Amino acid sequence: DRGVSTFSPEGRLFQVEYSLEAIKLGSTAIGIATKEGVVLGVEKRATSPLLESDSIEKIVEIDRHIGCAMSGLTADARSMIEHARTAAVTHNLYYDEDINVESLTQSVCDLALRFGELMSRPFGVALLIAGHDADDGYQLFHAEPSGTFYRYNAKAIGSGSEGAQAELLNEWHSSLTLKEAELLVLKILKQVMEEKLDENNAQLSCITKQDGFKIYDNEKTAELIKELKEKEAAE
């Protein structure tokens, strides 16, 4: 056939480029970083109404100060999360402190290119890693299966990403409040989702310095959806 670690004539790894196509098929995930916190939101996308949607876990805690959202082949993320959690905890054991968000992200991205003929293929999932540390404040990173990670003020991944990213381009500014960010994620998720957005097919979460990483209750999100509807009808 052909090598798993083969370069294309353009200078790209076939398998990495193909895994990026799998991520495009995944459900949408959005992150927005502010000076009051970072917000993470996801589309749940249940395949059937009999599927209990609260068992869909696409937003995950890595440590108290670091959260993570996923898009793509979500089964592939489990070992990545396991590693991230282990790295966060291990660093605390070795250094009696919280690990930097960037350092955690870098540790996760080191796994990415460990494939060949190690694992047999790249990961088919992209991660939005959000967190806070004392040195660089509130941060949002986009971790890819290429091993590359970019920091973002705001970022969308998954099937509705390019439409969402264009929307984030216009809406983000350096003075956004946490409440403004929450509504903004909900607004853009609603825009790109196939089904109508509610508290059962979408999920919100945030990371603040004071309270750490928190996944939002369905009741809490439902209020923010109602607040969104009213302010859009306000003009």
Binding site: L93, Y94, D96, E97, D135
Partner: protein
Amino acid sequence: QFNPYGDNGGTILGIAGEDFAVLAGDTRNITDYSINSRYEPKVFDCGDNIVMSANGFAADGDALVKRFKNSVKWYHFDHNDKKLSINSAARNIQHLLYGKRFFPYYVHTII
């Protein structure tokens, strides 16, 4: 039978002030009843405003200080030149020492 350990004598002293700290040590190095050196530095600046001394068996003392200095260097590489706080340095040194739990660094360390 071969004895991997020895005693190079020496005495060290650490005192913490309100907004300062001192780490002192004598400069004499010995074996048995002989003087090896009248000036062999024992307290070391390890960077990041941390001073260290590993008193007892000098070979283990030098090895440990060397490895800690190295750990400070790699802490900067791996964590965006972040300053290694004294509490973090202490926890790190515990792991260096316990790594050789069953063949110990025969030293009493103070930072």
